Design an enzyme around this catalytic site. Structure first.
Site, PDB file in Angstrom:
ATOM      1  N   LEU A  42      -5.167  33.171  -3.142  1.00  0.00           N
ATOM      2  CA  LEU A  42      -5.981  33.984  -2.254  1.00  0.00           C
ATOM      3  C   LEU A  42      -5.140  35.033  -1.543  1.00  0.00           C
ATOM      4  O   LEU A  42      -3.941  34.857  -1.310  1.00  0.00           O
ATOM      5  CB  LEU A  42      -6.697  33.103  -1.230  1.00  0.00           C
ATOM      6  CG  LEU A  42      -7.819  32.232  -1.793  1.00  0.00           C
ATOM      7  CD1 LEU A  42      -8.319  31.253  -0.749  1.00  0.00           C
ATOM      8  CD2 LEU A  42      -8.952  33.124  -2.271  1.00  0.00           C
ATOM      9  N   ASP A  43      -5.796  36.141  -1.218  1.00  0.00           N
ATOM     10  CA  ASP A  43      -5.165  37.223  -0.484  1.00  0.00           C
ATOM     11  C   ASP A  43      -4.569  36.699   0.817  1.00  0.00           C
ATOM     12  O   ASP A  43      -5.161  35.854   1.494  1.00  0.00           O
ATOM     13  CB  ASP A  43      -6.208  38.307  -0.205  1.00  0.00           C
ATOM     14  CG  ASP A  43      -5.625  39.535   0.425  1.00  0.00           C
ATOM     15  OD1 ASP A  43      -4.389  39.619   0.513  1.00  0.00           O
ATOM     16  OD2 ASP A  43      -6.409  40.412   0.843  1.00  0.00           O
ATOM     17  N   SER A  44      -3.369  37.180   1.152  1.00  0.00           N
ATOM     18  CA  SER A  44      -2.784  36.801   2.434  1.00  0.00           C
ATOM     19  C   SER A  44      -3.598  37.391   3.574  1.00  0.00           C
ATOM     20  O   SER A  44      -3.812  36.740   4.605  1.00  0.00           O
ATOM     21  CB  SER A  44      -1.327  37.253   2.522  1.00  0.00           C
ATOM     22  OG  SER A  44      -1.199  38.650   2.726  1.00  0.00           O
ATOM     23  N   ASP A  46      -6.599  37.571   3.222  1.00  0.00           N
ATOM     24  CA  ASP A  46      -7.714  36.636   3.217  1.00  0.00           C
ATOM     25  C   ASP A  46      -7.352  35.331   3.918  1.00  0.00           C
ATOM     26  O   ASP A  46      -8.245  34.659   4.437  1.00  0.00           O
ATOM     27  CB  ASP A  46      -8.182  36.371   1.786  1.00  0.00           C
ATOM     28  CG  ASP A  46      -9.539  35.695   1.723  1.00  0.00           C
ATOM     29  OD1 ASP A  46     -10.180  35.530   2.778  1.00  0.00           O
ATOM     30  OD2 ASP A  46      -9.977  35.340   0.610  1.00  0.00           O
ATOM     31  N   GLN A  47      -6.070  34.944   3.966  1.00  0.00           N
ATOM     32  CA  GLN A  47      -5.765  33.784   4.800  1.00  0.00           C
ATOM     33  C   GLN A  47      -5.844  34.162   6.265  1.00  0.00           C
ATOM     34  O   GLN A  47      -6.161  33.319   7.110  1.00  0.00           O
ATOM     35  CB  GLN A  47      -4.386  33.181   4.522  1.00  0.00           C
ATOM     36  CG  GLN A  47      -3.207  33.880   5.188  1.00  0.00           C
ATOM     37  CD  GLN A  47      -1.899  33.121   5.022  1.00  0.00           C
ATOM     38  OE1 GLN A  47      -1.759  32.287   4.129  1.00  0.00           O
ATOM     39  NE2 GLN A  47      -0.941  33.396   5.898  1.00  0.00           N
TER      40      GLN A  47
END
Ligand SMILES: CCCCCCCCCCCCCCCCCC(=O)OC[C@H](COP(=O)([O-])OCC(O)COP(=O)([O-])OC[C@@H](COC(=O)CCCCCCCCCCCCCCCCC)OC(=O)CCCCCCCCCCCCCCCCC)OC(=O)CCCCCCCCCCCCCCCCC
Ligand SMILES: CCCCCCCCCCCCCCCCCC(=O)OC[C@H](COP(=O)([O-])OCC(O)COP(=O)([O-])OC[C@@H](COC(=O)CCCCCCCCCCCCCCCCC)OC(=O)CCCCCCCCCCCCCCCCC)OC(=O)CCCCCCCCCCCCCCCCC
Lengths: 88, 166, 118, 74, 459, 93, 112, 66
Positions: A42-44, A46-47
């Site tokens: 997942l996109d950082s 996105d984290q």
């Protein structure tokens, strides 16, 4: 009173629960050990979203510096566990 | 300080101010989605100076998006809590002296507490050895506290076992 | 305000009202309506500017309160009685507004222009 | 202890529906967040429009108002 | 009065000859037993000031101030212990002896009829204090702030003797009774100038007016707590007192001569009241507070309305107990952590939950709270000064707001907001601390019932 | 940018310490507090109010007479209904 | 106030400011960080003693060379002060006048 | 302690019957009262504010200037 504490079972069910509500990845692999990025890629950014809306789940704290490096779910449970008052 | 937390911070608090902007949470959603695209087209270029430039442009364009009372969740510094209870936090070094009567008021606590007093009275030599060993000259570079290899405690523990929030 | 009376009466203030009539005195056509005895008017103590004509009604309302104490409603009628009397009175001062405004227009206009003819 | 269950919201027919429909027209292929779809579905989502608050209890209230004069009229 | 002079003089050998460990018991005991008869001293009645003996007498004002002194010894001495509580016996008996002798010369001074006996006993009062604070003052570099402190006094404090003796041989008797009834008007000119200025500035050095106020802060940070309660609860009221009496003469002069000093005290009240807001190191705050209230006193003295005196003396006593106590709080906080610096520690609402009530209560009594005697005196003074100038209330009430602000700021940041948690020393309270606090406030709150004791000669 | 593994172990065993310390911190063995080693009640509170009525009212029963001016009340409102009434009124409807 | 310009930090300022700054910092953090058992009293840190001693006005007693200093202080206690002298003497004398002549309309004044 | 408060996550908070009974009751009280005395009251309470038609009173007409 504001009676109910967040216990380990509860918080587990919560981080677990909302991460199962995240749609773009499947409930297929979700485990406290299951890697929060490397597994799901997942996109950082996105984290940053995950910690955003999870903070809005529990409503407190989570400074940016500590929020940066969180990753794996068990760990998030841990941070909420020492920051809140959790253990028996 | 790196590009990472710079960008990511601007994104995060941008979402925060955006939260404070709208209502009913759906308009907040698809607006936050348009923003998700606004940073989503980004990040695919490793060009160096172009990026920081455009970022700063988002620093002014962001600074326009601040209304003066952004939403603040209670526990951080803010108009709700930030230690409402602070008069209730009594450090464990108090109660080191109560009257032996009241020290007998709760006979079994100080048992285990005495197991702590011995836990960390037996300690601190193991601690000072491990630390004085590990530290590079002056210990300048590290604010961290690396663990203990042998079986036992993590050396600078004492204050880090705290009076808890209420 | 019908007469100047005098300060040799030893009385400043409500024993000397503007005069015993509270407001105007109405030289005008005829007199001023009836009367309410100043002594009674004091022995039921009435705030100034609460104290006018129509007190015939008012002081009876102050009766009706202590008439039936536990009743809260008591007389709505006497309430409406001094409401009505002072309705009509404030309307009278309205009519004085009228009289004087029209006297202005009439004697101002007529006497100014028809005085300015020659 | 709490038994949260799981899995049943679906993001359907509930205003996040129309949201993701406009975004769909924009070709963003969903954002995220069936959670706020919890914030919609339930005994909620019927809600009330204002002036309904000033219509809350009128029925029984001026019902008994309707009867009220029945004392002096009979 | 002599019945009050013997028992303390006998209280000296009580100290000197005694078994070790009983000195505090014997001294405290018999000293309170003195305080009883100090309370006997009130016969005062009608018009004529009572006269015990042809050498020295008492009017009202001398009686409240005296009662305050004889009351203050046992509490003082009671407080001074555990500042040391380790030494050779000779240090203890020397110190208690010195407090005694000091009290003796104080009683001499307040009771003294004749102004030269007043003056001799005056500097004779100053010496014992000096020995106290200098011989052991905790001596930060010592500052040499006892000795040239005595030079701050004598520098311009000597010539008042000159002026006196002049008054002596011109009019004969310096008895205060006969200086009254024989007082004759003195016109405004240059000789009466240097005279009035002599006596005035001579006493005005003691209660610091804003010009000279550098006098107090150092001398009062270097003082051991006994010397502090000596100093600011009493030794200013000597200056203001003698001022009260010698203003008997100087009748027209004090107008044209007063005006500049009045100005300086009305402005310096605000200035001092300001500077005491921003400082660190708590021990100074209460000092400059004392400077403020004393400036207000001088303002009250020069304008001669009787109201001015009633409020004045009321402020002497009320500020005596209040300032004294509040010092003793600063000390009781100092034994806990060795600082003197305010901001260093904090909390103490959590910890020491009782000591709160004494902090609060005392600070409020310095906040000018309406029933408190401090507000009786301050209030009447404000009435007098407003009578004198319709305008001055801007400055006065502005002192009301500032005195509110710092007086209530001290109540916080020592006592509230967090525990600094690197302390882990402070030992909860004592019974002695509660005894001291109580012995201060409880009378200050009771006097707020029957004040007519403490209001001045004119009443 | 995940962590330092050192910090993973440190944080972990610090959690261990919080575990044990808080296990301790919950106290309910043996109920450790062990300090030593319809009308009539409402009429008793009605006494709690009534004794002030006794004292205070007594204080005023001797008090008022003992001192010349106190309890000074507004002269009771008098109406022309009492004594002698003069009206001559009727109307409007 | 108002973080702005988003400084590029260059190279030296990066290396120097970072390494040296957090160098000294972490040195002192760890320094007072010892926090062992067996200390009963305060931690005493030499910080804030400098604060106290300096704020006790170390240069107060020495002197005040002129420069602008005597102008800032003298004019700082000059304008409002002496003017207030003049106004209280003014209104003073006026009050005395309206007492001695005409009327101040004191009528009953009494306690004064 | 536990009142059967039933702390709940994500579903509609449970409600005590008697409570909505109370609230609804007081709704009926407010409007019953308000339109009750609204039938017992008036928002124009007396004879109406006057009109210039009597401002003629043409009998008053000036004597000397016909
Ligand atoms: C009303 C009349 C008009 C008043 C106008 C002003 C109103 C506001 C005043 C300021 C705020 C007062 C306040 O509550 O402060 C907090 C202060 C302390 O509260 P705290 O520290 O938060 O809680 C106590 C501890 O937490 C835990 O301690 P504790 O709970 O175990 O014990 C509490 C209590 C235990 O008691 C004792 O220790 C025994 C005291 C024996 C006194 C013997 C004489 O007090 C103390 O321990 C120490 C405080 C008492 C010191 C001595 C008396 C000071 C009186 C202060 C003024 C009166 C305020 C309330 C008046 C109410 C009407 C009577 O409380 C008081 O000051 C109340 C004192 C009550 C005891 C005496 C009652 C009768 C006294 C005679 C009449 C007094 C009239 C005074 C007129 C005004 C003078 C300035
Ligand atoms: C642990 C509990 C602590 C409680 C603290 C107080 C709480 C407040 C409520 C107190 C209720 C009881 C008061 C005493 C009983 C007698 C009352 C009575 O009959 O009054 C009318 C009664 C009237 O009879 P009277 O003889 O015809 O009138 C004489 C005038 O009142 C003479 O005219 P006056 O202008 O002198 O007026 C008297 C006024 C004013 O008195 C003062 O301002 C005295 C000032 C002394 C200054 C000393 C400075 C030392 C340096 O004082 C009072 O009204 C009493 C308040 C002060 C009590 C002080 C207690 C010790 C601390 O009042 C008196 O006789 C006054 C009595 C003398 C004052 C001291 C009385 C108290 C003695 C210690 C009692 C401690 C409390 C006992 C426990 C209570 C709860 C379980």
């Amino acid at each position: 009173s504001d009676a109910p504490p967040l216990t380990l079972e509860g918080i587990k069910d919560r981080v677990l629960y909302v991460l199962k509500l995240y749609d773009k990845i499947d409930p297929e692999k979700l485990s406290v050990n299951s890697h929060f990025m490397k597994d799901l890629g997942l996109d950082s950014l996105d984290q940053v979203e995950i910690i955003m809306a999870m903070e809005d789940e529990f409503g407190f704290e989570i400074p940016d510096i500590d929020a940066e490096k969180l990753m794996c779910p068990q760990e998030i449970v841990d941070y909420i566990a020492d920051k809140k008052d959790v253990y028996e | 300080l790196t590009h990472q937390q710079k960008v990511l911070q601007l994104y995060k608090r941008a979402l925060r101010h955006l939260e404070s902007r709208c209502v009913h949470r759906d308009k907040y959603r698809y607006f936050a989605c348009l923003l998700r695209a606004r940073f989503d087209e980004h990040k695919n270029e490793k060009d160096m100076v172009k990026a920081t430039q455009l970022l700063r442009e988002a620093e002014k364009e962001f600074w326009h998006g601040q209304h003066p009372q952004p939403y603040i969740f209670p526990e951080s510094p803010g108009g709700t809590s930030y230690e409402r209870y602070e008069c209730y936090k009594v450090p464990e070094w108090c109660l080191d002296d109560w009257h032996p009567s009241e020290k007998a008021m709760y006979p079994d606590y100080f048992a285990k507490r005495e197991q702590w007093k011995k836990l960390r009275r037996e300690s601190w030599e193991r601690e000072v050895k491990q630390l004085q060993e590990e530290t590079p000259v002056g210990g300048p570079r590290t604010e961290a506290l690396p663990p203990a290899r042998k079986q036992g405690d993590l050396p600078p523990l004492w204050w880090h076992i705290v009076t808890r929030p209420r | 305000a019908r007469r100047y009376l005098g300060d040799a009466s030893v009385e400043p203030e409500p024993l000397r009202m503007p005069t015993f009539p509270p407001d105007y005195g109405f030289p005008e056509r005829k007199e001023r309506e009836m009367v309410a005895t100043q002594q009674e008017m004091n022995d039921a103590q009435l705030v100034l500017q609460q104290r006018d004509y129509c007190a015939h009604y008012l002081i009876r309302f102050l009766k009706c309160k202590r008439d039936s104490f536990p009743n809260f409603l008591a007389c709505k009628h006497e309430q409406h009685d001094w409401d009505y009397c002072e309705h009509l009175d404030y309307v009278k001062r309205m009519k004085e507004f009228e009289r004087e405004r029209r006297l202005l227009q009439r004697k101002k206009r007529r006497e100014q222009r028809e005085a300015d003819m020659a | 202890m709490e038994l949260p269950d799981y899995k049943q919201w679906k993001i359907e027919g509930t205003p996040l529906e129309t949201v993701q429909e406009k975004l769909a027209a924009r070709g963003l292929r969903d954002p995220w967040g069936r959670n706020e779809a919890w914030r919609y579905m339930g005994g909620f989502a019927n809600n009330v429009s204002f002036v309904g608050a000033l219509l809350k209890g009128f029925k029984w209230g001026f019902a008994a108002f309707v009867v009220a004069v029945g004392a002096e009229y009979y | 009065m002599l019945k009050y002079i013997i028992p303390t003089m006998m209280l000296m050998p009580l100290t000197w000859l005694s078994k070790n460990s009983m000195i505090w018991i014997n001294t405290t005991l018999h000293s309170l037993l003195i305080s009883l008869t100090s309370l006997l001293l009130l016969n005062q009645f009608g018009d004529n000031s009572l006269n015990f003996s042809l050498t020295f007498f008492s009017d009202s004002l001398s009686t409240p101030l005296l009662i305050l002194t004889m009351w203050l010894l046992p509490l003082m001495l009671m407080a001074s212990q555990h500042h040391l509580s380790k030494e050779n016996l000779a240090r203890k008996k020397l110190f208690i002896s010195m407090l005694i002798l000091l009290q003796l010369f104080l009683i001499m001074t307040f009771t003294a009829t004749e102004l030269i006996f007043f003056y001799i006993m005056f500097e004779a009062t100053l010496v014992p204090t000096l020995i106290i604070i200098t011989r052991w003052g905790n001596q930060t570099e010592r500052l040499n702030a006892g000795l040239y402190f005595l030079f701050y006094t004598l520098a311009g404090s000597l010539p008042l003797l000159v002026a006196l003796i002049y008054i002596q041989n011109t009019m004969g008797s310096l008895n205060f009774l006969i200086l009254q009834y024989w007082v004759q008007p003195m016109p405004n000119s240059w000789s009466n100038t240097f005279m009035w200025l002599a006596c005035m500035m001579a006493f005005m050095v003691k209660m610091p007016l804003y010009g000279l106020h550098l006098w107090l802060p150092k001398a009062h940070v270097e003082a051991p707590i006994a010397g502090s309660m000596v100093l600011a609860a009493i030794l200013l009221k000597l200056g203001g007192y003698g001022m009260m009496r010698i203003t008997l003469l100087l009748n027209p002069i004090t107008d044209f001569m007063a005006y500049p000093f009045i100005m300086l005290s009305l402005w310096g009240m605000i200035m001092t009241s300001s500077i005491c807001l921003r400082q660190t190191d708590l021990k100074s705050l209460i000092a400059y507070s004392s400077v403020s209230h004393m400036a207000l006193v001088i303002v009250a003295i020069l304008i001669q309305t009787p109201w001015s005196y009633m409020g004045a003396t009321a402020l002497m006593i009320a500020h005596g107990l209040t300032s004294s106590m509040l010092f003793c709080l600063a000390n009781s906080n100092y034994e806990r952590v060795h600082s003197r610096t305010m901001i260093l520690a904090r909390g103490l609402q959590t910890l020491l939950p009782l000591m709160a009530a004494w902090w609060l209560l005392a600070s409020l009594t310095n906040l000018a709270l309406p029933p408190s005697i401090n507000l009786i005196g301050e209030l009447f003074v404000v009435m007098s000064t407003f009578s004198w100038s319709n305008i001055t209330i801007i400055l006065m009430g502005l002192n009301m707001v500032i005195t509110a602000l710092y007086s209530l700021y001290m109540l916080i940041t020592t006592q509230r907001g967090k525990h600094t948690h690197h302390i882990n020393n402070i030992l909860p309270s004592f019974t002695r601390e509660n005894a001291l606090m109580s012995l201060h406030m409880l009378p200050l709150l009771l006097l707020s019932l029957n004040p007519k004791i403490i209001l001045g000669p004119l009443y | 940018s995940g962590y330092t593994p050192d910090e993973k172990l440190r944080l972990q065993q610090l959690r261990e310490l919080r575990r044990r310390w808080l296990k301790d911190q919950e106290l309910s063995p043996r109920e450790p507090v062990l300090p030593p080693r319809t009308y009539r009640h409402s009429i008793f509170a009605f006494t709690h109010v009534l004794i002030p009525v006794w004292i205070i009212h007594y204080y005023l029963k001797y008090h008022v007479t003992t001192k010349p001016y106190t309890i000074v009340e507004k002269k009771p409102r008098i109406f022309p209904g009492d004594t002698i009434l003069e009206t001559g009124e009727v109307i409007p409807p | 106030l108002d973080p702005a310009e988003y400084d590029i930090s260059s190279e030296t300022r990066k290396a120097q400011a970072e390494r040296l700054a957090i160098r000294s910092r972490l040195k002192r953090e760890y320094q007072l960080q010892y926090n062992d058992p067996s200390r009963r009293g305060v931690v005493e840190d030499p910080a804030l003693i400098r604060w106290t001693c300096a704020r006790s006005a170390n240069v107060y007693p020495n002197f005040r060379p002129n420069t602008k200093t005597s102008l800032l202080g003298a004019l700082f206690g000059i304008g409002p002060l002496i003017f207030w002298y003049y106004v209280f003497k003014t209104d003073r004398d006026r009050k005395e006048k309206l007492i001695q002549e005409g009327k101040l309309d004191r009528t009953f004044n009494i306690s004064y | 302690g536990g009142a059967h408060i039933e702390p709940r996550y994500r579903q509609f908070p449970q409600l005590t019957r008697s409570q909505v009974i109370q609230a609804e009751f007081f709704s009926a009280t407010m409007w019953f009262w308000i339109l009750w005395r609204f039938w017992h009251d008036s928002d124009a309470v007396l004879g109406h504010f006057p009109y210039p038609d009597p401002s003629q009173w043409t009998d008053e007409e000036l004597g000397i200037p016909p």
